[PDB]
Amino acid sequence: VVGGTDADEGEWPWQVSLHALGQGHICGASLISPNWLVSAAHCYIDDRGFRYSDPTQWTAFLGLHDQSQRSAPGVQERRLKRIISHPFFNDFTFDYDIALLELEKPAEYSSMVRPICLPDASHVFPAGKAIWVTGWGHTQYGGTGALILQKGEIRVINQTTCENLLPQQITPRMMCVGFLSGGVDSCQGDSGGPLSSVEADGRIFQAGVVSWGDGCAQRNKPGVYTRLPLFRDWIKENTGV
Ligand SMILES: N=C(N)NCCC1CCN(C(=O)[C@H](Cc2cccc(C(=N)N)c2)NS(=O)(=O)c2ccc3ccccc3c2)CC1
């Protein structure tokens, strides 16, 4: 996260960290139930040197705050039993960049581990609404990741403007969130993480999945996120959630 600040410990109990066997933090995820997490599909694509699509190659850390303190009290470690990438995911356009990750064993709800609420299919996160992006990703484009979870406030951008800023790259499954001036934005390593939106009664709903961006925090290049409401039924059908 670029232009963010240290989050308070336990401030985002739904934020999860996904480590690949011997590679440390690779992507973020969100806890949505005792057994399921939501993340970005592009994080689980095999490459010639490593099988990122193999659930046994991952470890999820829930209730984590500092990457250098993965054993701290309250931090839960879990293995993945399965990775369900959206069938329509497109590695080239990044359309349908969303995945469901089944925990090998249930998360234990605590003050540091708690699911984020999921929005109904018909709900719309309005342009201009303040949203929170969190993650251990880079704090600067071409920089390095954060040890302490970072948080940043950004805003939903009008879909038409989004399409115009990134021509031939924005599908209806995507949504721009951030600022045209840049400054605050997600970045490498934040992919898979959730957008947290404070709703009418203070409860937090997931407004999207960190997916991609042209650089990080650049002017006129807000981050592109996978929308959530559009996948409510898909999540329910695949996880029972
Ligand atoms: N085979 C593979 N391992 N492929 C990995 C592809 C890529 C997917 C998403 N990523 C990004 O979009 C980054 C960083 C980023 C991540 C999330 C949000 C934002 C944001 N600005 N809000 C920025 N953006 S970039 O313009 O620097 C870039 C794009 C595509 C690339 C392809 C290959 C190598 C480097 C790349 C960098 C990181 C990695």
Q: Residue 81 belongs to a domain with what CATH number?
A: 2.40.10.10
Write out the residue range of the structural domain in which residue 190 sits.
Answer: 1-12+116-229
In a shared domain, residues 127 and 97: no
In a shared domain, residues 67 and 24: yes
Tell me the two tokens of residue 154: 């950004």
In a shared domain, residues 47 and 128: no
In a shared domain, residues 56 and 5: no
Residue 168 Cα, ligand 1 centroid: separation in angstroms? 17
Resolution rounded to one decimal, in angstroms: 2.1
**68-98 core/surface letters (b: 16 or more CB in 10 A; e: else):** eebeeebbbebebeebbbbeebeeeebbbbb
CB atoms within 10 A of CB 24: 14
In a shared domain, residues 168 and 120: yes
Q: Is the CB of 150 under 6 A from ligand 1?
A: no
30 a catalytic residue? no
185 a catalytic residue? no
In a shared domain, residues 90 and 78: yes
In a shared domain, residues 224 and 129: yes
**Number of domains composing the chain:** 2
In a shared domain, residues 131 and 39: no
How far from 118 is each of 1, 52, 128, 199, CA to CA, in Å? 23, 26, 20, 11
Residue 114 Cα, ligand 1 centroid: separation in angstroms? 29
In a shared domain, residues 25 and 110: yes
Tell me the two tokens of residue 235: 């999540």
In a shared domain, residues 46 and 104: yes
Q: Outline where 43-125 has alpha helix (H).
A: none
* Contact in structure between 171 and 95 (CB atoms under 8 Å): yes
233 a catalytic residue? no
In a shared domain, residues 131 and 211: yes
Q: Which atom of ligand 1 is nearest to the CA of 42?
A: 8
Q: Is the CB of 223 under 6 A from ligand 1?
A: yes
**150-165 core/surface letters (b: 16 or more CB in 10 A; e: else):** bbbebbbbeeeebbeb
The CA distance from 55 to 102, in Å, is: 9
CB atoms within 10 A of CB 59: 18
Q: How far is CA 222 from the centre of its chain?
A: 15
